[PDB]
Amino acid sequence: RCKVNELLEAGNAIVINQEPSDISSWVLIDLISGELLNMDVIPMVEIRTLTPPLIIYANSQTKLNTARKSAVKVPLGKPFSRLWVNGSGSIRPNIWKQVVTMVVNEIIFHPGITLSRLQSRCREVLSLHEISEICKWLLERQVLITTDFDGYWVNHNWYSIYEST
Amino acid sequence: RAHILSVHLHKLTCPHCNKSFQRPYRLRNHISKHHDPEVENPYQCTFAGCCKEFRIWSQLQSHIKNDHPKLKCPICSKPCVGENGLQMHMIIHDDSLVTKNWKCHICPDMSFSRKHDLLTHYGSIHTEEDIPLELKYKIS
Amino acid sequence: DVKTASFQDIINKIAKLDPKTAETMKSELKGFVDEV
Ligand SMILES: [Zn+2]
Ligand SMILES: [Zn+2]
Ligand SMILES: [Zn+2]
Ligand SMILES: [Zn+2]
């Protein structure tokens, strides 16, 4: 997302001629779905004429990068009290990155999912209180929006949780 | 704007002792000590996508100054944060990946096909002074 | 393969069907990138 944002804001155009990987699929459909990207096609001249290389570019001076991150603190407490808090009373960064990813993964395909329904799908891992903690943090980071009647719905740029890999 | 933030929206006040602070930064530090939870690491990295946490404010000051120094692009002077920020932005100038077009900084008409050929216009209608840095910078 | 092409060659191919989109692109864009 950062590479694409910098290129498009710089007035560059991205050219696709082969299948983007499963990860580049998320970030491309997200930008396309937001109406921020214009698309044009490089024509040709067999089956291949129906699948020409595609060009993508930013529509205008409009911004693609989201606003700077605020200090949304991880929910913590007495030692061992949460799956992500160890015996020295410290955040297990691995487990926190895993549980936040897991909860967003189930809320993506189920727009509107309620806390009760969500606990049923995660019962072998998290208690209801632990999901109330994860959902509150994700709302504060704007990854989720509350639907009416207390449901959760994934916002644009939802994959932008943490830097890694 | 100042009246609202100084007479109604009391955002600079402590939620507990009801002192107040001249910037949100010092209010954050105050809450992290004088009203702190039982947590071992009261300080957490304030930046984009960084998940690390610290025992003493000096270690956080060190971590921000080490891993999130605010830089300016060597070529275009636009600001960025940390080593990843610079390395991500350096792609934009890269002539190997970004097979960019070639134009004069002033003359509207130009339409070159190679980098060496573009230097002919800057070498004749201009000179080696006031050529743009991205064209000049053979830095790799 | 368009991977080998120049910026002028790519805009020329677009102009073969419609010069309006090609002229608009040349007047606005700074450069292509392969999605790699
Ligand atoms: Zn206080
Ligand atoms: Zn950090
Ligand atoms: Zn630059
Ligand atoms: Zn000129």
Description:
In chain A, the strands form two sheets. A three-stranded antiparallel sheet of chain A has the order 1-3-2, covered by helices on one side. A three-stranded antiparallel sheet of chain A has the order 4-6-5. Chain A contains five helices and six strands. In chain A, a hairpin with a 3-residue loop joins β5 and β6. Chain A is elongated, with a radius of gyration of 20 Å. Helix content of chain B is 38%, strand content 9%. In chain B, a hairpin with a 6-residue loop joins β3 and β4. Chain C has two helices and one strand; from the N terminus they run ααβ. Chains B and C meet through β5 of B and β1 of C. β1 of chain A pairs parallel with β1 of chain C. The complex binds zinc ion (4 copies). The site of one zinc ion (ZN) has 7 residues of chain B, from α3. The PDB classes it as transcription/dna.
SSE blueprint and pairings:
The structure is cut from a larger assembly and holds chains A (165 residues), B (140 residues) and C (36 residues).
Chain A: H1 2-9, E1 12-16, H2 22-33, E2 37-41, E3 54-58, H3 93-109, E4 113-114, H4 115-121, H5 128-140, E5 144-147, E6 151-154
Antiparallel strand pairs in A: 1-3, 2-3, 4-6, 5-6
Chain B: H1 2-8, H2 24-34, E1 43-44, E2 53-54, H3 57-67, E3 70-72, E4 79-81, H4 82-93, E5 98-100, H5 115-122, H6 133-136
Antiparallel strand pairs in B: 1-2, 3-4
Chain C: H1 7-17, H2 19-26, E1 31-34
One zinc ion (ZN) binds at residues 45, 47, 50, 52, 63, 67-68 of chain B.
PDB class: transcription/dna
Keywords: transcription factor, transcription, TRANSCRIPTION-DNA complex
Entry title: TFIIIA-TFIIIC-Brf1-TBP complex bound to 5S rRNA gene
Defining key terms:
part of a larger assembly; 3 chains; A: 165 residues; alpha+beta; three-stranded antiparallel sheet; 6 strands; 15% strand; elongated; B: 140 residues; mainly alpha; two-stranded antiparallel ribbon; 5 strands; 9% strand; binds zinc ion
Tell how many strands the DSSP assignment of chain A holds.
Answer: 6
What is the gyration radius of chain B calculated from CA atoms? 25 Å
The pair of chains with the biggest contact is:
A-B, 25 and 22 residues
- By DSSP (H or I, 4+ residues per run), the number of helices of chain B equals 6
- Fraction of residues in β-strands of chain A: 15-25%
In N-to-C order, the SSE pattern of chain A is HEHEEHEHHEE
Organism (chain B): Saccharomyces cerevisiae (strain ATCC 204508 / S288c) (Baker's yeast)
Zinc finger (C2H2-type) (chain B): 12-35, 43-68, 71-93, 102-126
Protein name (chain B): Transcription factor IIIA
Subcellular location (chain B): Nucleus
